[PDB]
Design an enzyme around this catalytic site. Structure first.
Site, short mmCIF file in Angstrom:
data_model
loop_
_atom_site.label_atom_id
_atom_site.label_comp_id
_atom_site.label_asym_id
_atom_site.label_seq_id
_atom_site.Cartn_x
_atom_site.Cartn_y
_atom_site.Cartn_z
N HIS A 102 0.78 -1.17 -0.11
CA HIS A 102 0.09 -0.03 0.07
C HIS A 102 0.68 1.37 0.00
O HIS A 102 0.35 2.55 -0.18
CB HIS A 102 -0.89 0.22 1.29
CG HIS A 102 -2.24 -0.86 1.10
ND1 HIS A 102 -2.72 -1.37 2.27
CD2 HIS A 102 -2.93 -1.10 -0.08
CE1 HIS A 102 -3.85 -1.96 1.59
NE2 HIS A 102 -3.88 -1.79 0.43
N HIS A 326 -8.94 10.27 0.24
CA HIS A 326 -8.13 9.05 0.09
C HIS A 326 -6.71 9.15 0.81
O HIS A 326 -5.96 8.35 1.23
CB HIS A 326 -7.84 8.66 -1.42
CG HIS A 326 -7.24 7.47 -1.73
ND1 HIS A 326 -5.96 7.47 -1.83
CD2 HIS A 326 -7.70 6.18 -1.96
CE1 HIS A 326 -5.71 6.12 -1.94
NE2 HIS A 326 -6.75 5.30 -1.90
C1 LIG Z 1 -9.66 -3.34 -0.92
C2 LIG Z 1 -9.03 -2.87 -2.30
C3 LIG Z 1 -9.82 -4.06 -3.39
C4 LIG Z 1 -9.36 -1.45 -2.68
C5 LIG Z 1 -10.33 -1.17 -3.37
C6 LIG Z 1 -10.55 0.28 -3.65
C7 LIG Z 1 -9.55 1.05 -3.38
C8 LIG Z 1 -8.30 0.80 -2.76
C9 LIG Z 1 -7.09 1.46 -2.43
O1 LIG Z 1 -7.36 2.63 -2.79
C10 LIG Z 1 -5.91 0.99 -2.00
C11 LIG Z 1 -4.90 1.90 -1.38
O2 LIG Z 1 -4.71 3.11 -1.94
O3 LIG Z 1 -4.23 1.88 -0.48
C12 LIG Z 1 -6.04 -0.18 -1.64
N1 LIG Z 1 -7.00 -0.98 -1.88
C13 LIG Z 1 -8.13 -0.67 -2.29
#
Ligand SMILES: CC(C)c1cccc2c(O)c(C(=O)O)cnc12
EC number: 3.1.4.-
Length: 436
Positions: A102, A326
């Protein structure tokens, strides 16, 4: 300003709310340095889009993509990059189930030095378009002259801690970046690195990562004040993991306990900020913003106790109430929200996978994912606390908090955004419903 904390540009707000903001094209522009090579650590990549964000003259310089994808997802990413001969890929090992890579970070090697960017955006168009995202920009780090022997280290230990973070990957493409960092002077850095890396950490490694890393930094480099139990904890995130059947399982036992730490000695209000359905519906993007807020009904229905802690997204201070978050942030405001004892911007959401969960009779911290953030401590700036900036883009030792304080509790009719159920009662800003 000494903090170098920015928001991404948002399409659709008035220019005054983008004046001090940064788009990815601004970060990669030659005004920031003459690019020699770059590494892009991230979760999701659109490689065609990403190459177009580099200035035309830099689009053939080497790029390393550090990702966590496996099997078919890995093949797809490799297919995306094959048209670009200058792009190499590094697959971060994920040896613990349900882990993800991540971390969002850019290493930018220039003729003039080195820059580190730790941020919250995926490398896709939508993450830089109408979301609230956070960026920390390092100083331009000069090269240490060949033959000179100096540490290049900062009072926050940032150089050693970044090298430690990269060493955890055990990856040959990142050994080259480690050698680059060794060769540069990072002594001007005033933030602490807080990372997560997958593993099971005990003994001397227990305090290296996750919420025990945060706890260690707060014990060592912050001070407790009188009436400390009246200083709230604020957590602000874009998804929630499975936290357990009640708050004592993890949230208010080990997580809050790390977050409450101040100083070396041995009922605090907890505010969690997470978009409601109404926040998403009326947002710039509409319901599709909820595609990036992945809270599942399966998880949520097992922890309804959690939602009594939830507060709406509101960001009038930065003109961003309709730009869904976000960014992830954690901070410790004073009881009247006029000061903060510290501020963290990170990729880490509110989950055990990101922050770690104790195992083996409290002797081992187990982390599933790679995460990375930076911690602002007043002591690193010669201060006792940070004054909160009243308007994010107005006006030098006041810290720019990107959302409104105090946070506003969900109303009785509000519900947390849950991405895999339908919303068919009221249309969004584009005229559409949500049918997963
Ligand atoms: C759970 C997964 C499939 C997921 C879905 C939608 C957005 C995500 C996201 O933005 C991240 C991130 O940026 O860490 C990480 N997983 C994300």
């Amino acid at each position: 300003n000494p903090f170098q904390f920015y928001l991404t540009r948002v399409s659709g707000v008035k220019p005054k709310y983008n004046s001090g903001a940064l788009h990815i094209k601004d970060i990669l522009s030659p005004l920031f340095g003459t690019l020699v090579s770059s590494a892009q650590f991230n979760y999701c990549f659109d490689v065609d889009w990403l190459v177009k964000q580099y200035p035309p003259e830099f689009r053939k310089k080497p790029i390393l993509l550090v990702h966590g994808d496996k099997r078919e997802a890995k093949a797809h990413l490799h297919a995306q990059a094959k048209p670009y001969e200058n792009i190499s890929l590094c697959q971060a090992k994920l040896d613990i189930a349900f882990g993800t890579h991540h971390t969002k970070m850019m290493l930018l090697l220039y003729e003039e030095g080195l820059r580190v960017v730790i941020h919250t955006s995926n490398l896709i168009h939508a993450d830089w378009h109408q979301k609230t995202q956070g960026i920390w920009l390092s100083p331009l780090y000069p090269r240490i002259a060949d033959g000179t022997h100096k540490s290049g280290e900062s009072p926050t230990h940032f150089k050693a801690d970044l090298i430690s973070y990269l060493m955890a990957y055990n990856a040959p493409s990142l050994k080259e970046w480690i050698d680059v960092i060794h060769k540069h002077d990072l002594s001007e850095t005033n933030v602490y690195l807080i990372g997560s890396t997958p593993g099971r950490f005990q003994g001397s490694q227990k305090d290296n990562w996750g919420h025990f890393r945060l706890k260690k930094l707060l014990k060592d480099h912050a001070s407790s004040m009188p009436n400390a139990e009246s200083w709230p904890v604020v957590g602000q995130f874009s998804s929630v993991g499975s936290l357990g059947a009640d708050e004592s399982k993890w949230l208010c036992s080990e997580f809050k306990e790390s977050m409450l730490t101040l100083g070396k000695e041995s009922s605090v209000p907890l505010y969690l900020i997470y978009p409601s359905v109404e926040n998403v519906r009326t947002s710039l993007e509409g319901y599709p913003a909820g595609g990036s807020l992945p809270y599942s009904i399966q998880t949520a229905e097992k922890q309804n106790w959690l939602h009594s802690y939830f507060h709406k997204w509101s960001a009038e201070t930065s003109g961003r109430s309709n730009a869904m978050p976000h960014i992830k942030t954690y901070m410790r405001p004073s009881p009247d929200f006029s000061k903060i004892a510290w501020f963290l911007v990170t990729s880490a959401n509110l989950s055990k996978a990101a922050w770690g969960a104790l195992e083996k009779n409290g002797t081992q911290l187990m982390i599933r994912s790679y995460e990375l953030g930076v911690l602002f401590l007043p002591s690193a700036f010669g201060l006792d606390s940070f004054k909160v900036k009243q308007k994010f883009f107005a006006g030098m030792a006041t810290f720019p908090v990107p959302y409104d304080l105090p946070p506003e509790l969900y109303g009785s009719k509000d519900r947390p955004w849950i991405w895999n159920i339908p919303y068919v009662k009221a249309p969004d800003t584009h005229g559409n419903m949500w049918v997963p």
